[PDB]
């Protein structure tokens, strides 16, 4: 939530076989928004988490509300 409000980056739990290229196209096709930077890590439980830094044109807070997890 802090990253969404301050850094304008959303956070997702993505498929473990999804790379930065597919994560970008998945977010674009699912939420009609433009990522500009993606950073992925693998949690200690062996599940991928990806930080999706959105553009300045769109804001994380409204997109999070549209998704419904805000």
């Amino acid at each position: 939530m802090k990253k969404i409000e301050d850094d304008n980056t959303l956070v997702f739990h993505v498929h473990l076989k999804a790379n930065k290229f597919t994560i970008k196209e998945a977010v674009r096709k699912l939420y009609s928004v433009e990522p500009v930077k993606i950073n992925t890590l693998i949690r200690p439980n062996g599940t991928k988490k990806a930080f999706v830094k959105l553009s300045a044109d769109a804001d994380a807070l409204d997109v999070a509300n549209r998704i419904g997890f805000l």
Partner: peptide
Amino acid sequence: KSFRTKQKLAKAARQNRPIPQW
């Protein structure tokens, strides 16, 4: 630590889990 050991450690830590109360 590969994906495999990360999943192995997670399942090892999932075995010693408190029983559900139902």
